[model samples]
Target: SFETRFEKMDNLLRDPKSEVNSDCLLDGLDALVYDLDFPALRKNKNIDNFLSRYKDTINKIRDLRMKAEDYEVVKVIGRGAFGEVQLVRHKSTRKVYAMKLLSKFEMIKRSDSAFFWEERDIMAFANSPWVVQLFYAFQDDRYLYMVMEYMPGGDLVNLMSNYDVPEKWARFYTAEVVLALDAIHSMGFIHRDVKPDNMLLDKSGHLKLADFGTCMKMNKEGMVRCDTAVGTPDYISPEVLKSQGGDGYYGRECDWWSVGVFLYEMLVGDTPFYADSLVGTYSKIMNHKNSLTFPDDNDISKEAKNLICAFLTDREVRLGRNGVEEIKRHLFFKNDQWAWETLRDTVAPVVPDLSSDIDTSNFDDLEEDKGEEETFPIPKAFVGNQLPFVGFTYYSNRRY
Candidate 1:
């Protein structure tokens, strides 16, 4: 019934010359009978109720379509299972941003319902300054698009490929990630994927945790059974591979293990466990009892190695099982010189001014234009009800 009424209203509104008002549209409706008198208007509330609902529906639809009209895709930054990520600019502000466009049809086809929900949940709960910030989200019939803060320095993987990061720089960056993990974990979320690819670099060269497509909320009982077999093989922990274990591991612990792997890579320039195949990699991760050794050729300090060993150890005592306090007080961070009150205050070695450097002229080539403009139709019944109106003349006069 709503759809049929919406179709009729849509036809009426589409014509540029249409002059029909609220009273003219409602005159034909039997159930929407009303009068100017207060008692008559109160008794016939259906018309007003319908209008309010329609207004809300129309507002929501208009908001979605407006987002599509406002922003234009500049260039693609990354691509993965969900969809491609693009560098986008706000037409009004000219501010550059990252946009992840996920194909809902493809997600349903691939049976990735859990992944879909996980991404939504993670983005909803994420509030860390060190984590990538989401501006807004909108969806069309085919795809869901999330507008995110653009990190021009690329991901940690790209950064590592070009430069051999100094020990001081690596330690500082890793500490920031540790703080980020602590913040998220304290909020009851676990970031299952923590490899270099998911870690992005801001314009100031500081790390920002990016992807949350694989993240999940930690159970209240501190353990959750997950059989998704997710994450990169080299970065995965032993508990993740053991499918037949007595008690399924906590998602939080699995994240800690990944942090260990990340720390190893940061210090040594390679993963602690590696193999040509996935099985071989799992074997190395499970069977290897010895602590990862740092190369003698590297000028990495003993404190840095100690910190890595503390994280990489399977035992609770050596690792940060007691809490993040022990890890914070480790010898690696001997001086309070590197510690900052917050991510905003943290000074970066190489602060790249992306506004001055990035070339946005190629953006026009990526956009495709169709002839006709898109429109969203809201129901008349909804528009006539539900919305609150405090006052008319008094509200308008408040601006004075």
Candidate 2:
């Protein structure tokens, strides 16, 4: 009940403890200040009443606690090669968030799971509408969970499946992603995996980049050591594929290649390097032997073609290698004016059908919120595999 949850939170705020998740309490506070029903928040007293009722001790705080009991699961929203995203509501606040659950067995099997901790921590600190929000993380006996904001619009993969989007909408969505990429790079990280499946849309139909399992932290000075084969084959950069053999070195430029491929798909409805096998795909990417095409229809423009070509240009001179400025300055976006600072205010290309606050219409139907718990023997090497980056939490004043 809201009554019960508010009391617990209010009580926890009065006397902060080690288990309260204090850094995130501010997120819960604003709603309490504007608690309401429909357009009449004054008609609703849940949030405002709580705020005014505890004015003397209103400055609340919480501690980070790890437990599976804090949340209530309702259904699964997404699944991938390595993880599952479930829709869960907080027991006390009654607020809904997507809980990303991943199989530790699979993590241990592929040696890829450890990298996920790197992922959760990155998203936990990043505050942007263009990026998915990760509150924090916890674990049960068999699975790791990343509790985050649930974007009901589903990911671009499912949306793009319906049909190729119009160029204007594609640019709109891509522009948002460009902002996300810039954010990651500014923080000394490179999102190694940039693909449709990894990008999600919010309820308002805005873009939020997700899936950070492959985001690589680079040297601040050299911008080197980007050597893993970590992205989807069709959208991967040629330099990233070339690095698999250690012949050459690549850096943030690799990400630009992916952006180019996605832009191509966004406009033309297919990948420039589509092939039957991974090898064949990589062959095409590395050799530039692609069967790229554009619609003869006038809907596609030369500016759009130039935009894609600039990104697919040799990795050394790729569009985004120098950051978002060079890319945004392209003639493609000249007349399409929406100041980047106020982008969220601009109308989105697709607004998700949200039947209610808790509706899952735009999301895919799920078999269950939590996958069946497995009983595999723990490996000696995989036991006690938690790694925490020293500064694990960040709070930002920016509203995204």
Each candidate: what lDDT? 0.61, 0.69
Candidate 1 minimal-lDDT segment of 10 residues: 387-396
Candidate 2 local lDDT, 1-400, one digit each (tens): 9899998877664432212344335434432332221234334466356555765553343233444677787777777666777788888888899888777566666574368756766676676666788775655335667778888888887888786688777778777888888888887887878998888888888888887888767875636564456678888777777675564466787787788888888877778887788788777787663455565767778888888888886777778767679887877776555877878798887887677667787676867635365634533222333222111223322123
RMSD of candidate 1 to the truth, in angstroms, is 12.7
Candidate 1 lDDT over 52-119, as tens digits, reads 55656545644544345677666766665756788878788787778787755466555544464455
Candidate 2: pairs in clash: 19-63, 20-62, 20-63, 21-62, 21-63, 21-64, 22-62, 32-47
Candidate 2 vs. true structure, TM-score:
0.76
Question: How close is every model to the real structure, measured as TM-score?
Answer: 0.71, 0.76
Candidate 2 yields a Cα-based lDDT of 0.69
Please report how far candidate 1 places residue 128 from its true position, in Å.
2.3
